[PDB]
Design a protein around this ligand. Structure first.
Ligand SMILES: Nc1nc2c(ncn2[C@@H]2O[C@H](COP(=O)(O)OP(=O)(O)O)[C@@H](O)[C@H]2O)c(=O)[nH]1
Length: 306
């Protein structure tokens, strides 16, 4: 499996840098930006400059029009980077000029190539202002036209569960971890399975041409960890208002060490199928993280929600 993760713009590039640091098994990372300096800074091993860096006016690059035109002009470079992938993840912070405008073009290029294309993006914090929130939603409207699944993370919802005198860096770190959670949860079912390997056709079925999606995750240790982690995932703040019996698809990743047991696989699957519909596709897989000993994580991606 060839899986590529593309960070688009400053925010997405920061999120993908977090994914590089904290590791996602068996994926290739890319950063796509108008900002040549940013691409020079980044730890991402593959970079793609779009638009070659021409602005017209101080702050003119905050307009999504600029990101869209830049990616439009460099569609051939994007296609050469994406081609050969079985799956593409697009990460972006929506609301700025580059991510908002260029992420839907990156998605369109991937989708036109026949690649299963999953976007995981954020909306700005409320304190960033109404102009950025409006740009973000307009970009998400365009992005939804060109992806198989779209997971939109409201940064403002993350901010409320963080409180305190958190730094802005940690505020964006919280969004980064959610984005990583979603990408890693989907991709590692393919790139490093555990005792139960998912068929890629099933991943395609739950994610393909599905529209809106949402991710929740949970972790637990000890004897009841499998049921505990599944329940925490189901009840996480991101999934709590999703009726899981209204999701057209559910993809579940159980991640644990070598000591994952078959009966734990069965428990998690039975729990998830108790909340989902039989008129839905439910896919349960495992990933192996040899560094985990006692802990078990369940990540749930609900797709085709409305
Ligand atoms: N996760 C993350 N999000 C960011 C960061 N900086 C900005 N954002 C969010 O992403 C949105 C777009 O900002 P930015 O990506 O820098 O603009 P762009 O490069 O033109 O797309 C902002 O409005 C913020 O909500 C960051 O370092 N990490």
């Amino acid at each position: 499996a060839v899986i590529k993760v593309i960070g688009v713009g400053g925010g997405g590039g920061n999120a993908v840098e977090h994914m590089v640091r904290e590791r996602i098994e068996g994926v290739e990372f890319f950063a796509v930006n108008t900002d040549a300096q940013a691409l020079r800074k980044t730890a991402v091993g593959q970079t793609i400059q779009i638009g070659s860096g021409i602005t017209k006016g101080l702050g003119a690059g905050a307009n999504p029009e600029v990101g869209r035109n830049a990616a439009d002009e460099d569609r051939e470079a994007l296609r050469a980077a994406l081609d050969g992938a079985d799956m593409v993840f697009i990460a972006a912070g929506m609301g700025g000029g580059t991510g908002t405008g260029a992420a839907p073009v990156v998605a369109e290029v991937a989708k036109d190539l026949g690649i299963l294309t999953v976007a995981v993006v954020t909306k700005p914090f409320n304190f960033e202002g109404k102009k950025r929130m409006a740009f973000a939603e307009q970009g998400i409207t365009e992005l939804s036209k060109h992806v198989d699944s779209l997971i939109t993370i409201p940064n403002d919802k993350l901010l409320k569960v963080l409180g305190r005198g958190i730094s802005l860096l940690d505020a964006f770190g919280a969004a980064n971890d959610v984005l990583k959670g979603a990408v890693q949860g989907i991709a590692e079912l393919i790139t490093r399975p555990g005792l139960m390997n998912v068929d890629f056709a099933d991943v395609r079925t739950v994610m393909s041409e599905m529209g809106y999606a949402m991710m929740g995750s949970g972790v637990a240790s000890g004897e009841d960890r499998a049921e505990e982690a599944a329940e925490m995932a189901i009840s996480s703040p991101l999934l709590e208002d999703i009726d899981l019996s209204g999701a057209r698809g559910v993809l579940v990743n159980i991640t644990a060490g070598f000591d994952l047991r078959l009966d734990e696989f069965e428990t998690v699957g039975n729990t998830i199928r108790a909340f989902a519909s039989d008129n839905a596709t439910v896919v349960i897989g495992t990933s192996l993280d040899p560094d985990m000993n006692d802990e078990l994580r369940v990540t749930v991606v609900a797709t085709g929600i409305g």
